[PDB]
Structures are given as C-alpha cells and as structure tokens.
Design a protein around this ligand. Structure first.
Ligand SMILES: Nc1ncnc2c1ncn2[C@@H]1O[C@H](COP(=O)(O)OP(=O)(O)NP(=O)(O)O)[C@@H](O)[C@H]1O
Ligand SMILES: Nc1ncnc2c1ncn2[C@@H]1O[C@H](COP(=O)(O)OP(=O)(O)O)[C@@H](O)[C@H]1O
Lengths: 740, 250
C-alpha cells in the first residue's frame, strides 16, 4: 500500500509474552484504544495476534517487539511488518495445546494444573492456531504449541473456557530453532557497548549486497576485551544468533592440543568452512594461548603459528562477507604486531558492571526461580560491591542449593519421592541470600572502577558561587563550541582545588561528574606512593589510556602532596622541588587532544611545597580557595548529614551551630556518629534489660536522638585545625601572587 | 507405615562396636529404657540387633550409627532405616564364630583365648546370625563372622555361655568390602573442613536424578590444598569410599 503501515521491529521493554507497545502519535493515527486486538503480517505469510498498549518510550516509526512472537512470525531483527486491527474476536470452548518432548525432560506428575491453570487466568490472551508460547516455573521454562481451536482460526481466552491438553508431545519440525538459544534478552548491563557493537556490524550482515555495489571497506578486525568471566563468548554467540548468520567457534587451547601440521590443517579448514557459508562470523577466544607477547615465547612452533595466523588473516582482504571477532584477557597481553591496520583496528572494552547492571543481571537469573515475597533484590544490589556476573550466577545457584539443602530434602526422602508439584511450592528466602553472600563469596576484583557517581549538589551544604562557576568552567564549551570558536579562545582543561584538610574535597568533584553524566576514575595518594617506591612508571600511560577509553570522564587526583611530603618536609630530603611521578604526569598530560573531554582535577592541602612547574598554562591553572565552613553552611551541612538518620524534631541544632566556629565538616559529621553510637548502645542495653526483666514485647523506647547524646558528644568534641595554618593559607589572600 | 520410625543414618560418637545412641524426646516417644535390645531393618532385608543408649548430642530425627553395623546392613550414609524393639531375647549355649583368612596373615598360636575371651566378658552383647564384628589387639584389628546359634536366629551373650570356634577360615563373598578400606572414623582434626567438603558434594552423588530434572550447574572444580604430608589423598579416598562411588586415581 506504501502507506505508514510498514514498520521496523525492535526489542521490547514489556515483560508479557504477547503484548506489543507502541507510541502515541502512531496510535492516534491508527485510531485505536488500549487493549485492542491487533494483527501483524510479516514475511512467509505468517500471522501474529497481539494486545496493543501505549508508551512514550517508542519513537515515531518503530515497534517494541517480543522475541517469542518475532520467532513465531519466522522473521528476525531488521524485517518489516504490517499492522491491521482485528476487532471481531470471540471466546472459545476448547483449547488444544501440547509440549515438544525435547524441552520436557526429567518431568513427572500432572502437567496441566501446574502450568496451564496458573497461566490462563485473569489475562484475556489472544491465541491463534499453530502458535508456540513460553511459560516459566518449576526452576525451568517450557514452550507450548497449539493445534486446534473451535472459533477457527483464532480466539481470545478468558476464565470462562476450558483447555483440553490430552496427548503425547510432538517432535519439532525442521524450520525453527529452540528458545534455549541465547539472545538479546538475557544480558544485563552494558547497554551502550551492546549498542555500539550492534551499530558497527549491522550493515554488512543485514544488507550484504549494498557492499557488492559500493567499494568501501568495512571494519573487519574488531576486538573486545574484559576481565575474565564476563561472558564474552556469551555476547558473541548472542549477537551471532540474534542477527542470524553462520557461526563457527575456534578455541585456543583446542588448537594447541594437536600436533603441528594437524593444527595447520585445522586452522585452514576452519577458515575454508567459514568461507563456504558466507555471510558468517568467526570467533577466536583465548588469543593469549595462541599469540602471546613475543618476549614470553621461547620455542619454535609458536612463532610459526603466529606467522600462519598473520598470513591467513591478511589473505582474506579479498573476501568481504566474513568478519573476525576475537577476545583476549588484556590489551597489554597480546603481541603488538597483531593489532595493526588491516588486521585488528577497532577496540571495545566490556568492563565490569555496576549496581544497575548488577540489578539487571540478577533480574536475568531469577527469571524462572519463583521467589518469595520478602526477598529484596535492592539489598543485594547495593551490598555487592566488586563482582563479576559469573559470581552472581554462582550466588543465585548457591542460594537455590541452600533452599534445597535446608527444606524439601530430608523432609521428603523419609516418606516419598520428589516431583514437580512440590517444586511449585518451593521458594527461596532472603536468609539464604544473606547466608550465600556472607560466606562463600570469592570477590574477583581489586582493580580500578569506572562508574557514574551518585552524590548530587544538595548533598553538600552551601558553597554556591563556587559550584556555579565550576559549572561555568566545565559545562559550557561542550554545549556551546560556536561561541568559543567565534571568540577564538581555546578552553582551559585544568583546575586545582586547594584548602585546609577536611572541607569536603571529593564531594564537589562527585557532583560535577554526576550532573553532566560523566564517568569517574579516581587515584588516591597511596597509589602515588606505591608507584614511586617501586620505581614503576609504565603504569601512568595505562591510566591515561583507560581515561581516553572512558571518554568523557573527570580524573581525580587525591593527596598530591604525598610525594613531596614523603621525602622530608619543606626542607625535604637531599633533593629539591621536583620528583619523578609528577613530571611523568605532566608529560602524559600535555601531549593529548584538546577536544576529547578528559578534564583533570587535582587536589592538595599544602599549596606551598608543591612543584610550581604544574601551574603553567595549558595545564592546571585555576585556583579556588576552599575556606572553613560558615554558620549557614554549618546548618546546611548538618541537615545534609542528618537526613539519613531518624532524629527527633524537638531537638535544636542552632545552639551548637552558633557555638561551634572554626570547625571542619568532618568533625561535624563524626559527632553525629558518636551520638548515634551512644544512642544505639543505650537502646540495645534497655532492650536486653527489658528482655531479662520479665522473661529473664516490643515497645520501642526511642527511635531517635535527644539532647543528652549531643551534649555528651560535645563533651567529647575536638577541633582539628590550628590557627597558624589558616594564617599560612591567608598569606595567599594577602599576597595574591599565584602565577609561578 | 509413614510414621516417625523411618530415620536417617549418621556417624557415631560412641566407641563400642554394637551400641547406638539416640536422643531424649525420640526415646520418650518410643517408650524404652537404657540398655534395651533394639532391632533395625534397612535395605535388602538385612537386620541389625543393637543396644540403645541415650544422649543429648543427637538432634530430633537422626541416628548416631557405627560403621561396622552400617556395613553389616549393606547400606551407606544417606539411607533410611526402621526401628523396632525386640525385648524377648534369651541366652545361648554354643556360639559359632570364625575369621576370614584374608585378614589373618602371619598369625601363629591359639586364636581363641587371645581375642575372644578378652572380648566376650562383662558385656552382654547382642549377636545375630551371619554377623561380622571387629576386635583389636596384637598390633592388629581382626574381623569375625558368625555362623550358627542355638536360640535361632539371635541371642544376647553373657559370661554364662561358651563359644565353639573350631574350623578353618572362609573366603569373603563377592558383595561386601573389607574394613581396612579407609573411612570417616580415622581422620583426626579439621572437622569443619570435612563438613564443608561433605555438604558441597552430597547432592549430585547421593541424588543424581534430581539434577536430571533441574538444570542448575553444580560446582565441579573444587580444589583443596595444604602443606605436604597432611593426607589429601587419604581424605579424598575416604570421601569417595564413604559416599560410595567409582574411584580412579591419576
Ligand atoms: N558536608 C560535608 N562537609 C565536609 N566533609 C564532608 C561532608 N560530607 C561528607 N564529608 C566527608 O569529607 C570527606 C572528604 O574528604 P575531606 O574531609 O575534605 O578531606 P580531609 O578530611 O580534609 N583530609 P583527610 O580526611 O585526611 O583525607 C568525605 O570522604 C566525607 O567523609
Ligand atoms: N552479565 C552476564 N549475563 C549473563 N550471564 C553471565 C554474565 N556474566 C557471566 N555470566 C555467566 O558466566 C559465564 C562466563 O562466561 P564465559 O563465556 O564462560 O566467559 P569466560 O570463558 O571468559 O570465563 C557464562 O557461562 C555466563 O552464563
């Protein structure tokens, strides 16, 4: 018809297996309501009946499409479908649905009331003939095929019908695949990297003939890496099985497990077999087993194997319908002659996930688990700092095995055997989650983390003008390069905080990285000391390579004065005013691109004994005095700390605010900690006294703090900063010379 | 019967080779006294006669079970047994017990008064037909098989009887193992590590078909280490010969 009814498929955000979400101007163009019965026609004359729903997440012309119904239509991602309303659907009297025997194995008991009757209630579901849907439960996920309906050829189902499920399972026909093949639905986290790998490879695989009409070379050597266990083979096979090409898998240890000429014949026949079924993808994992760093290679057959791989990958420039993906452990653990132009050009890091990614990975792995009601995935989302996803698979399977070990075991073996009806009753508790998270958790990470921070501007009290002109200093030229191009001034890229210790030096950097949606990689002082004492400075280049790879980002140096204080004070050691790591930092600083959005933030508390070679233009040049807090900042910081804890309202904090002057913010965030420790000790002792009183039940004495704890904490209080350091810093206010 | 008479075996803390220790609410439910003659039926219609004693170390539903009597019943750890009182046991007049030649080698002299008469005094011991017990001494530990009793088919023994030990030793039949195979009784110390290795491996070996109904991967690469000489091969072969699987050694 060539009208807007020809639409492009996508992934779905909805979690029902038969609903389709669409946008508002599109749905106002088609004149429907919510919950209408809609019909989809695609390729090879297949049909889909669905419920339509409305969402603003959809764009102008796309369709949020589920995977089981897109495999029901026998189409894939990148195909076009046709949309028609079918508003004349009645109810049925008999429903014929039956499994395929290849996915129901080990199963005993009745199948009908355990799955079908928990499914076909309360959801009027549109079913057409020959359809295969998918349900979960029983620690499993089973698909189901329908055969016959009374209102031919489709109906909507309701509580007011029956389903006749009689018969034996039927073998799967030759055309479709199973649904235990992995896909785009079961990879939690790292959505941007998946989008980048999706957009980089879509054209020569979905439209191969276009590059048979245009001679422009696509990128063919694309290399992803990451710390191990993160499922690089999983995402590789997911992309290859989702976009629909021929797959073949070369693993490094198997090729090293043969003789010499047998390995040569294996690699040659593998590349010929990948040539035969074009278009196709090819995958080499554990490249460290095949082509290591050259200094770590000692024999003779290994260099011959690496030269064989170089000739075999240079000799497929003529072909353009295969593409090579590979996976190592680290980019510094490959031979440097391999990753060059014509062999391996594109580079992508997977990285470690974060709390949102951990929540999504946990949402993947409790899909067919049948949780309880008291289990709280936000708890084990926030309490699981520093983990990879295979540890999360181990954690979920460990808690499931503990629920099998505690109950539903010795209770059952003394009387009967085990079926799936009692597997329906099995849920797991949060106690097994806390038990599997307390012990038996080998945390597989000690390295540097990269994430967006969470502290916002309202978490720090006051300091308002400094926040707004820092916002001027970073936020402006990334949004308006035309004004700077008009006035010809290149922007500065350095800023140097300084101030007395204990004034909240990390919080403003966290707020700037959180508001502009920037990554964050921090380096403390102890990292500088363990790079100085070991005399190892081939690590700074790795840090700034990671920084450029994490673009955009803000790089935070904490305790820069440690290397100048460590070898003596202001007299110092026998040396002078320079060192090793700081000039290595300058040399790797000034030799990079101006527009790459890597913004370097330094910090110290001793601004006099620092090397003045860092205050050159083109480097760190912006100085901001961070002073002691004032009383309005004191009440603001005190409320911003006390917002977490339950406090009383009749207590008054302006007495101590008007009393305490010249105090660090760290002191006024530890005195509340001291008072709350005193209150928690008082409450637990009154708890054990009322327990031992009549019983040798819960009327809580106080959930908050009174004036007594604050008065005793002020009797335990202490200032942290002397007056002479304030005069040493106000020397810079009196003198006002700060260029070099 | 599906009542609480179907119990799960365990290790024992008692050191007599024929007594069984049980808990107090269980023994008040069965209405017995200490030292009563009790009977155990398990798999393959084997029988065990025992002395019952009381302990608070036992939990609600478990049985502190000795290794020689659990091999006498031809069951293993993880099996369920059945408990019945047999309070009608008399004494005997002639007792027929004889060794197996594969465990008495290098031995000379009279066998009767060196082992049997130091054993069958002061302990009224419950013996049924076909039973194999185990005694120690002479820098060795010898097992013994009984053949025939006068009050058929079981008795309790006392100082007021005789034991006729005449004959040559009989070859071991094909079904059972020896008792010089290592087990859970001869590893001192490190009980928590043995409990951890016990709980980590019990499910895919005692109940294999459950993971033929549930697809969840068990842990398969488990690595123990230690400073050398601490008997890592001993605890490995002990767990494999105690839980009862096929072993092979690389
Ligand atoms: N509102 C606040 N005002 C001041 N400090 C705060 C505030 N909120 C949190 N902090 C703490 O301030 C820390 C930032 O370091 P900061 O206290 O400025 O350095 P310092 O204490 O002066 N030097 P040091 O403690 O030895 O590393 C954070 O880690 C918090 O623990
Ligand atoms: N983010 C994740 N999403 C889904 N599964 C994961 C994830 N991370 C780890 N896994 C699981 O951990 C295992 C490790 O992936 P694998 O391909 O074996 O990596 P490697 O071989 O490098 O260890 C996979 O079998 C996968 O199922």
């Amino acid at each position: 018809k060539n009208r807007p009814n020809r639409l492009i498929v996508d992934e779905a955000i909805n979690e029902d297996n038969s609903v389709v979400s669409l946008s508002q101007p599109k749905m106002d163009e088609l004149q429907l309501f919510r919950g209408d019965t809609v019909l989809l026609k695609g390729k090879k004359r297949r049909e889909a009946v669905c419920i339509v729903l409305s969402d603003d997440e959809c764009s102008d012309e796309k369709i949020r499409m589920n995977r089981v119904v897109r495999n029901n239509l026998r189409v894939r991602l990148g195909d076009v479908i046709s949309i028609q309303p079918c508003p004349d659907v009645k109810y049925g009297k008999r429903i014929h649905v039956l499994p395929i025997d290849d996915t129901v194995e080990g199963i005993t008991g009745n199948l009908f009331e355990v799955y079908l009757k928990p499914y076909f209630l309360e959801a009027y579901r549109p079913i057409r003939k020959g359809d295969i849907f998918l349900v979960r439960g029983g620690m499993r996920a089973v698909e189901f095929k329908v055969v016959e309906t009374d209102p031919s050829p489709y109906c909507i189902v309701a509580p007011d019908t029956v389903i006749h499920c009689e018969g034996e399972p039927i073998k799967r026909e030759d055309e479709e695949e199973s649904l235990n093949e992995v896909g785009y639905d079961d990879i939690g986290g790292c959505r941007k990297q998946l989008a980048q790998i999706k957009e980089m490879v879509e054209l020569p695989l979905r439209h191969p003939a276009l590059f048979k009409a245009i001679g422009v070379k696509p990128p063919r050597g694309i290399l992803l890496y990451g710390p191990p266990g993160t499922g690089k083979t999983l995402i590789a096979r997911a992309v290859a099985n989702e976009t629909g090409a021929f797959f073949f898998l070369i693993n490094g240890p198997e090729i090293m497990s043969k003789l010499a000429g047998e390995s040569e014949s294996n690699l040659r026949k593998a590349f010929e077999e990948a040539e035969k079924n074009a278009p196709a993808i090819i995958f080499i994992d554990e490249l460290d087993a095949i082509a290591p760093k050259r200094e770590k290679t000692h024999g003779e057959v290994e260099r011959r194997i690496v030269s064989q791989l170089l000739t075999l990958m240079d000799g497929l420039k003529q072909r353009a319908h295969v593409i090579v993906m590979a996976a190592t452990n680290r980019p510094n653990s490959i031979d440097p002659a391999l990753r060059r132009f014509g062999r391996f050009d594109r580079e992508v890091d997977i990285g470690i996930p974060d709390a949102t990614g951990r929540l999504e990975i946990l949402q993947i792995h409790t899909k067919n688990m049948k949780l309880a009601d008291d289990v709280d995935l936000e708890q084990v989302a926030n309490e699981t700092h520093g983990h990879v996803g295979a540890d999360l698979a181990a954690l979920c399977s460990e808690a499931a095995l503990q629920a099998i070990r505690k109950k539903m075991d010795l209770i059952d073996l003394e009387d009967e055997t085990i079926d799936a009806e009692v597997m329906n009753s099995l849920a797991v508790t949060m106690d097994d989650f806390r038990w599997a998270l307390s012990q038996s958790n080998p945390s597989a990470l000690r390295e540097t983390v990269v994430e967006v921070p969470q502290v916002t501007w309202e978490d720090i009290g006051g300091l308002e003008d400094v926040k707004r002109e820092l916002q001027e200093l970073v936020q402006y030229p990334v949004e308006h390069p035309d004004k700077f191009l008009k006035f010809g001034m290149t922007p500065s890229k350095g800023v140097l905080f300084y101030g007395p210790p204990g004034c909240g030096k990390t919080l403003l950097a966290k707020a700037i990285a959180n508001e502009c949606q920037a990554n964050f990689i921090s380096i403390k002082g102890p990292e500088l000391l363990t790079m100085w004492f070991g005399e190892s400075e081939a690590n700074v280049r790795e840090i700034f390579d990671k920084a450029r790879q994490a673009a955009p980002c803000v790089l935070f140096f904490d305790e820069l004065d440690s290397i100048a204080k460590a070898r003596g004070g202001n007299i110092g050691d026998g040396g002078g005013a320079a060192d090793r790591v700081i000039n290595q930092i300058l040399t790797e600083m000034d030799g990079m691109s101006t527009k790459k959005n890597v913004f370097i933030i330094g910090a110290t508390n001793r601004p006099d004994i620092i090397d003045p070679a860092i205050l050159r233009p083109g480097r760190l040049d912006q100085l901001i005095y961070i002073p002691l807090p004032d009383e309005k900042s004191r009440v603001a910081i005190l409320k911003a700390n006390l917002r977490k804890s339950p406090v009383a309202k009749d207590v008054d904090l302006e007495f101590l605010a008007k009393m305490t002057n010249g105090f660090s913010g760290a002191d006024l965030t530890e005195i509340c900690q001291r008072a709350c420790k005193l209150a928690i000790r008082e409450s637990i002792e009154s708890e054990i006294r009322r327990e031992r009183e009549r019983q040798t039940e819960e009327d809580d004495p106080v959930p908050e703090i009174r004036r007594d704890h604050f008065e005793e904490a002020m009797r335990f209080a202490r200032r942290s900063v002397s007056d002479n350091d304030i005069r040493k810093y106000e020397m810079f206010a009196q003198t006002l010379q700060q260029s070099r």
